[PDB]
Design a protein around this ligand. Structure first.
Ligand code: F43
Ligand code: F43
Ligand SMILES: C[C@@H](OP(=O)(O)O)[C@H](NC(=O)CCCCCCS)C(=O)O
Ligand SMILES: O=S(=O)(O)CCS
Ligand SMILES: O=S(=O)(O)CCS
Ligand SMILES: [K+]
Ligand SMILES: [K+]
Ligand SMILES: [K+]
Lengths: 262, 548, 442, 548, 56
């Protein structure tokens, strides 16, 4: 079977498919050290061992469960590491990743995932060890524009707002600032707003023009939803199937006939 | 030209509406706001009364006003106010709307009159009825009629409490005291009056409005009981009955059970409430409470006014307080009645429908639902895409989803005359909205959204129900903001399009056609705006019995 | 048989139990094991003697830190559990020959009381089992210790709590898997009122036996509510067969082939199998090359999708060994499945809708809680007609200790009391036994 | 000398108190009353606002004041008022008492703190708790802490809204902010403080008081929800959590279900209401809400003050409005807290018990119950027989039945330390009362009375229940006046006699030991008297947001 | 119509509401099938049979 990922005849639909397609490797646009990543996450200190929420799996005793033991636990779960989070706001002005886009990508590509989609934020809750592995890929690659992708665990207002004077997304807590000298976005706070001892340079914003090419949101002044008739058609098909299924009397007509038979 | 453009221009004065960039962090935070400065001053003065217990403090948690804090225009009005003035706790007009609905109960009089004549050998005439109506306008607000040494309620506290009467019997109506009559022929246009009477027949009903101070002290479940007690006392008084005989029990049973029309029904235990609380008020019942239908022939206008009232009732008060509480859900609601935004979308949908199908021009089919819902949703989405200050206005996805889908759903109903087609259109709008923006509403916004298409036309147990009779206790609908107010609009929409006098119950429609109500139900928008400006006088205040 | 469908019943271990079984042999209306199970659910009562003794000693009456100073009663109840249990048997039974069963639990610190079916038969609803057991325990204790008349009402209060000032048994020291019908969300929801953690405790945290038990109760409830009537019946039977009872080993094999996979890979596997079996076919191709699929058999497609759903739950939550992701998993399994194919999701969107609210109310301030406390009579998770809650049961089997409201905290005593009942603990193997017993009688 | 003789002398000034004859029909009817005259004047001024809708009119039905219309002395006070001043609608103090009970909820903090440490790796200290308590006193009244562009509640409207904390752990109490601490060692005498702390243990609780204006706009069911919402927000703010993660659901579940202590439980469907409504408040729960126990060691005084409060809550507001309404039940209730009549009977019974048995001097037996109940009933009946103006005062039999039986029941409890012995004595008093005067109460007064003896000590299904846990939903008690207020007294009686710190719940007792409450629960009589004189300032008025 | 639901259905249901619930669903589907009721009209039949439930 060859997976389709999503319907649509425009580049926006294609960008979504590439995000979900596990054989597509994300283009790496920047470098972020493990320490800076851990620092921005704001859960622990670089250098300390992972903290547990329960004993390691082998130190616990389980009754036999064939089905359970057929599923490979992720490393963080093997070691009983606590669950932590990372959370993004994605500007509606063509941020390279978008909320349901993220969720669908994660559920195709990552294991042991808890992800919540909202209009103003998108969150992953994962074993901290595995969270850090995942998060690196989420901030180093094309899934992350330092200008239009905000890391924020609270006070998330901004995805729907106009960009600021330097083209950066609003952040009421200003966890990042614009470095005028280098033209870089620099994080001076962790994702919940605690000031960092040493700020973290996230590099240059992507161009407006680059975002238009790679974004996963439909916009009228770029590629309008109205132009993707294939996508609309399949959405309506899903809606219709649900409606007829709910009503039931026609799609289950053969089932009813037998119940009425004899 | 777009209907929301005027409001956006004033809300974002001196700003280029096409520009995707702006300035932040430059307003002095909360001190940019007159209302927040007022709040801060009162909080400081409160320290003494509170004996030092900490209170409102803008420096706790988030520093509000890193962006520019918006004013809002109540749609259809000239009122521009800060959002705080639309919070239900801060708006006496919203409070009085809820209380006016809560304190209202309708009771049939024919059964009682049959008891009087068949069991008690008393004759009922227009004169005895006029005497009865005078008695209950003394008894309902807490005056004694039978017993010696009764203490009584201070009339100054209950001036909003009264009883009126309406009847499908024009000859009887002609003979009743006009001071206590709701005149169907006067209050409704001729064709609507005829439609109402064709369902009502020559039956007679009284409308009892319990004191506001009573439902505030107590609850909605008090009302039908308070009504029934004083109906009982008034019959005993006006008709000189034995003050406590067997036939009296028939009055009570009629007034409390058999012949009573309540505004809302009881809740299940998990969210337990008595009758006449907002959760029990079905969408079509609320549509009938709102009175815009009899003063306007514009179906969009009738639906929009119903949605404004419903936003205040269902999202701000019911979901934002009764079922949660705190800062609450003011702007989840105001999105549906400010800045003429929803208006633009709805009037676009109506014109589209009128040109292509005609108003009530086609049978409902899935083809029609798909066509209209898709068109209206696309248009509504493109507006948020075309105007950066509009998106910054409806900054929450839930707000945008509700407003777009409301336009989609109402328009579908406008074309087909079918409310269930309407909500099916609503759910199509939502999942289409989701694919376009790769987002929809808050964490649990689309529970009913995803269940919606399948249950919209279902006929099973707790799934199938004609939309007019659905309400805040319909299982899919029991939890979440940004649906219920709009559902009230969709319940109204096909009946507005048809020019119907009512949506679900003619008796409820007539019962609120009454100028002596404090809240103006002919225009929820105008009353709410007056409350926002602190120009609305509510009922039930206690200044007469407390120190100055 | 009414329907033509035949199925193979496989155990939780992936091995064949019973071959070529007509679908109706696992119907709640025909299967004798399911009948016995439902019967036991309604008539079985847990009595906490240690709780009664402790409550009386402190006058801790009515629960929630209620104490009534001066009304203390000191009685060696647990010490005399056998004598009390025998008197309870005499008062509860209708004859020496009936199916009354009393069993000491945790060496008499607790008691399992199973009221005879004869009493259930002449009662309107199921509350009779608690009500009668309650009266029996009260009189057994009063008689055993000759409690003074003025102290006796403290014993009643200790056993049955605040009732009748409260509408239910608030603060009581007895319980039943079903709560009082006065607390039901919807009509006929009795069997939906069992928290997922109870299901897990009852099945001793065995994954597929938990999802099976939950599915049996949910789908049987769908018969009670009238949802599994006429046109819809076959949908619910197939749902029970495939998602609940691992029919044709589909569930066991989707998990097996995705042991190191994702929700996405489970979907791919499921869609492929559905195309292979003619359950689903291409209706048309779109300009991109995207193929839009349509069901060839709607009820059967739903059953397949529902099976992939439980498999995806086991794979994604099992990988985390953290149950919080079950709501997220149920939501995006359906979301991705629909856009992968253009087909309607499980239960035509209702499983997904449920997961949306389930996600919200297990990650926010407004209500809900951890996933283990949800059930079919919950306002949040009532909306799917049997297809969502089995995922929750499976997920809590897989949690290795990430929850505050864990199975032991919420459901420990409950597990000890009911897991002895073999049909509760191992439903799959015993339902297959029942199917074999009736397949030829259809 | 009889305690009621003072009040009777002032009430019947210049009349021979032994005389069985008097003059009637000579007072000018309603014009004898300053209050009735005020009412009539306000009724007239109201005609214009009502647009002519007829209103309060003393010429309708019964001509009040053919006899002399009494003033009432609130017992133990210098307040002599006409009865109208004690009607709950006319008495702002009675209204605030109900609202204060309704708007209060208690929530354990130990589970939330455990969630913080085990799931979120946050350490909880007195410093973080003090920070949390400051945050919630901003969030509970409707201030924003997390989101940008929140609108907020006007602090001037909700100055009565606050959160406090108490703990059975003395070391922690020494470290908590005094501004938000309820200090058990400070508010209670030493022996009571020790008893409370021994039942509470080292556990910690917050007491959340939702705004009065909120429960008046909405209902009791709002309160635990409003509390929980802002508890959640405050934890998110004070401990810098992800604003919406898995562990947050545990706070919610604790605050709404597992660790919450409500004032009242839900009603069955026929009389449907949510939590924290008067019907769900158990008698022993109300006794613990009343604070007289901690400022007085006189068992009669403690019981009498509970009955005063319970009279206003259960007969006047609950049965007189919620379950019926209209003129209502003011004097059914005032009989139990005016003119020191009940006081005399109770102090007689206590003296009788103290002399014969000693307070808490005997185990309960039927012999003891019969002895005390009969003696106190006889004495109470003989007072009404000996003083004609006393009988004219308690002119209704129900009033006389409730008062005598209360004295009988409380005395029995004083002797035995057993509340169920107390009510068994109550029911004996009633049927003895009936045989003596060949009358008792109103038509359906003694439903529970005749059912009473058998169910007082029953152990069956819906019959048996320790009296402290009975309440207005106990089936026999669900309907009728002149019982429930007195049942609260009998629930209090044995614990006052024992000198217990509480009757049913130590957390409830501590939660109302707070001077920052508007109503003074240490003396319900004195607060109600202040309301009668219009000297009591209630919360939740809307003057700040309405026109002058 | 007097409808007496089989004891077999009662035996595997928690309480007695099943008889009305099942009869209701049967009558709704019987009517819709007999007269081929339009999909958009069908929910009116459900409402006619079982009333305001589940709003009530
Ligand atoms: C803490 C939560 C989790 C939760 O259970 N509810 C919250 C907070 C809660 C609080 C915020 C109070 C405060 O700040 O002190 C209140 C007002 C409810 C209350 N307790 O009174 C509320 N949200 Ni919320 N909440 C809202 C909304 C939203 C939007 C805001 C997105 C944005 O870009 O600003 C997002 C959901 C989404 O992304 O779709 C949202 C999430 C959240 N909402 C996140 C906090 C997000 C953050 O850290 O900033 N709300 C809205 O979408 C608009 C309406 C607005 C509500 C207030 C009103 O209606 O006036 C408020 C409704
Ligand atoms: C009409 C009834 C039947 C009924 O269902 N309730 C009534 C009337 C009702 C009305 C009277 C209102 C009015 O007069 O306009 C109210 C106030 C309830 C309401 N609707 O608000 C009331 N009684 Ni009644 N009702 C009372 C009482 C009483 C006493 C009065 C006996 C006497 O000799 O005066 C007798 C019952 C009895 O004989 O035991 C009585 C009966 C009656 N009571 C007889 C009328 C008797 C008559 O024709 O005078 N009430 C009382 O015993 C004292 C408390 C008093 C209540 C008002 C208050 O508590 O302030 C009032 C309680
Ligand atoms: C789910 C349920 O909460 P519990 O799970 O019972 O705590 C329910 N709350 C709600 O539905 C809150 C509704 C309004 C707040 C959310 C609006 S999106 C209630 O309080 O009965
Ligand atoms: O963030 S949440 O979707 O949980 C609540 C928004 S009000
Ligand atoms: O006369 S009745 O006893 O019916 C009512 C008295 S309040
Ligand atoms: K703030
Ligand atoms: K009069
Ligand atoms: K109220």
């Amino acid at each position: 079977y060859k997976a389709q990922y999503t319907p649509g005849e425009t580049q926006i639909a294609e960008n979504r498919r590439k995000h979900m397609d596990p054989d597509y490797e994300f283009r790496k646009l920047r470098e972020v050290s493990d320490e800076d990543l851990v620092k921005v996450l704001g859960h622990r200190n670089p250098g300390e061992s992972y903290k547990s929420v329960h004993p390691p799996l082998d130190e616990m005793d389980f009754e036999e469960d064939i089905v359970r033991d057929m599923v490979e636990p992720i490393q963080g779960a093997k070691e009983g590491v606590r669950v932590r989070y990372i959370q993004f706001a994605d500007s509606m002005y063509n941020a390279p990743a978008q909320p349901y886009d993220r969720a669908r990508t994660y559920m195709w590509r990552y294991r042991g995932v808890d992800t919540g989609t909202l209009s103003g934020r998108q969150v992953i809750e994962m074993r901290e060890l595995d969270l850090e592995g995942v998060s690196k890929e989420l901030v180093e690659t094309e899934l992350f524009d330092p200008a239009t992708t905000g890391i924020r665990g609270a006070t998330v207002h901004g995805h729907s707002l106009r960009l600021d004077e330097n083209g950066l997304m609003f952040d009421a807590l200003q966890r990042y600032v614009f470095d005028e000298e280098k033209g870089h976005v620099v994080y001076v706070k962790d994702q919940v707003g605690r000031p960092l001892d040493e700020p973290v340079d996230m590099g240059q914003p992507l161009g407006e023009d680059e975002l238009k090419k790679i974004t996963t949101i439909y916009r009228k002044d770029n590629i309008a939803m109205r132009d993707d008739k294939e996508a609309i058609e399949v959405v309506e098909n899903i809606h219709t199937g649900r409606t007829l299924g709910g009503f039931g009397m026609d799609v289950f007509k053969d089932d009813l006939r037998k119940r009425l038979g004899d | 030209k777009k209907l929301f453009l005027k409001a956006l221009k004033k809300k974002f004065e001196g700003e280029d509406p096409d520009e995707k960039y702006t300035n932040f962090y430059c307003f002095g935070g909360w001190e940019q706001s007159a209302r927040k400065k007022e709040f801060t001053e009162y909080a400081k003065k409160a320290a003494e009364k509170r004996g030092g217990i900490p209170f409102y403090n803008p420096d706790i948690g988030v520093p509000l006003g890193q962006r520019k804090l918006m004013a809002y225009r109540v749609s259809g009005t000239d009122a521009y106010v800060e959002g705080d003035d639309l919070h239900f706790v801060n708006n006496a007009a919203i409070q009085q709307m809820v209380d006016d609905i809560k304190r209202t109960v309708i009771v049939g009089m024919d059964t009682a009159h049959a008891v009087l004549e068949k069991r008690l050998g008393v004759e009922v005439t227009p004169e005895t009825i006029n005497e009865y109506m005078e008695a209950i306008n003394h008894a309902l607000p807490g005056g004694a009629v039978v017993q010696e040494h009764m203490v009584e309620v201070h009339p100054g506290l209950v001036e909003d409490c009264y009883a009126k009467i309406f009847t499908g019997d024009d000859n009887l109506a002609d003979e009743l005291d006009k001071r206590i009559l709701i005149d169907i022929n006067k209050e409704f246009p001729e064709e609507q009056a005829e439609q109402l009477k064709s369902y009502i027949g020559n039956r007679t009903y009284q409308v009892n409005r319990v004191p506001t101070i009573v439902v505030r002290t107590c609850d909605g479940g008090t009302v039908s009981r308070w009504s029934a007690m004083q109906i009982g006392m008034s019959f005993i008084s006006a008709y000189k009955l034995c003050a406590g005989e067997a036939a009296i029990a028939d009055f009570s049973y009629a007034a409390k059970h058999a012949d009573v029309i309540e505004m809302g029904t009881i809740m299940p235990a998990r969210r337990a409430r008595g009758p006449n609380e907002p959760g029990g008020v079905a969408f079509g019942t609320f549509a009938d409470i709102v009175q815009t239908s009899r003063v306007s022939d514009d179906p969009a206008n009738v639906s929009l006014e119903v949605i404004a009232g419903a936003a205040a009732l269902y999202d701000q008060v019911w979901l934002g307080s009764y079922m949660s509480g705190g800062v609450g859900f003011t702007q989840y609601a105001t999105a549906a009645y400010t800045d003429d935004i929803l208006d633009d979308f709805v009037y676009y949908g109506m014109e589209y429908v009128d040109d292509k199908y005609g108003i009530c021009g086609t049978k409902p089919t899935m083809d029609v639902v798909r066509d209209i819902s898709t068109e209206v949703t696309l248009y509504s989405l493109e507006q948020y895409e075309e105007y950066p200050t509009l998106l910054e206005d409806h900054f929450g996805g839930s707000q945008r989803a509700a407003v777009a889908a409301a336009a989609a759903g109402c328009s579908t109903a406008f074309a087909t005359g079918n409310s269930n087609a309407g909500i099916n259109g609503w759910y199509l709008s939502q999942i289409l909205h989701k694919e376009a923006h790769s987002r929809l509403g808050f964490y649990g916004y689309d529970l009913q959204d995803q269940c919606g298409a399948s249950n919209s036309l279902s006929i099973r147990s707790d799934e199938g129900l004609i939309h007019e009779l659905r309400g805040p206790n319909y299982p899919n609908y029991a939890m979440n903001v940004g649906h219920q107010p709009e559902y009230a609009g969709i319940a109204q929409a096909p009946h507005a399009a048809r020019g119907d006098a009512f949506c679900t119950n003619p008796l409820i429609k007539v019962a609120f056609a009454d100028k002596d109500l404090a809240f103006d139900f002919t225009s929820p928008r105008k009353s709410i705006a007056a409350g926002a400006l602190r120009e609305f006088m509510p009922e039930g205040e206690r200044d007469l019995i407390i120190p100055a | 048989p009414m329907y033509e469908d035949r199925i193979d019943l496989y155990g939780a271990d992936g091995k064949l139990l019973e071959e070529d079984v007509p679908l109706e042999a696992i119907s709640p209306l025909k299967n004798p094991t399911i009948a016995n199970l439902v019967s036991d659910v309604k008539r079985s009562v847990a009595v906490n003697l240690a709780g009664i003794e402790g409550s009386l000693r402190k006058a801790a009456l009515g629960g929630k830190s209620n104490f009534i100073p001066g009304r203390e009663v000191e009685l060696p109840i647990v010490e005399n559990a056998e004598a009390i249990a025998e008197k309870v048997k005499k008062l509860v039974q209708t004859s020496e020959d009936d199916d009354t069963n009393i069993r000491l639990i945790n060496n008499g610190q607790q008691i399992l009381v199973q009221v005879p079916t004869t009493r259930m038969g002449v009662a309107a609803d199921y509350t009779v089992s608690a009500l009668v057991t309650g009266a029996a325990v009260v009189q057994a204790i009063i008689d055993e210790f000759d409690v003074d008349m003025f102290d006796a009402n403290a014993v009643k209060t200790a056993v049955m709590g605040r009732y009748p000032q409260t509408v239910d048994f608030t603060g009581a020291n007895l319980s039943t898997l079903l709560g009082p019908p006065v607390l039901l969300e919807g009509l006929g929801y009795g069997l939906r009122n069992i928290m997922a953690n109870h299901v897990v405790a009852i099945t001793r945290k065995n994954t597929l036996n938990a999802s099976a038990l939950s599915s049996i109760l949910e789908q049987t409830a769908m018969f009670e509510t009238g949802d599994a009537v006429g046109a819809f019946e076959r949908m619910h039977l197939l749902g029970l067969a495939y998602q609940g009872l691992n029919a044709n080993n589909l569930l066991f094999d989707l998990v097996k082939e995705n042991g190191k996979g994702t929700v996405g890979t489970v979907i791919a596997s499921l869609v492929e199998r559905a195309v292979e079996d003619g359950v689903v076919k291409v209706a048309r191709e779109m300009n991109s090359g995207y193929k839009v699929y349509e069901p060839a058999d709607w009820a059967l497609w739903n059953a397949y999708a529902a099976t992939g759903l439980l498999a995806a739950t086991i794979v994604n939550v099992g990988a985390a060994r953290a149950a919080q992701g079950v709501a997220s998993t149920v939501l995006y399994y359906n979301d991705i499945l629909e856009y992968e194919t253009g087909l309607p999701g499980v239960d035509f969107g209702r499983a997904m809708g449920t997961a949306v609210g389930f996600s919200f109310f297990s990650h926010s301030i407004y209500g809900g809680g951890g996933p283990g406390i949800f059930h079919g009579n919950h306002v949040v998770t009532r909306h799917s007609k049997g297809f969502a809650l089995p995922c929750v049961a499976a997920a809590m089997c897989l949690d290795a200790g990430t929850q505050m409201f864990s199975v032991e905290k919420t459901s420990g005593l409950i597990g000890s009391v009911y897991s002895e009942i073999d049909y509760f603990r191992e439903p799959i193997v015993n339902v297959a036994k029942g199917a074999a017993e009736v397949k030829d009688q259809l």
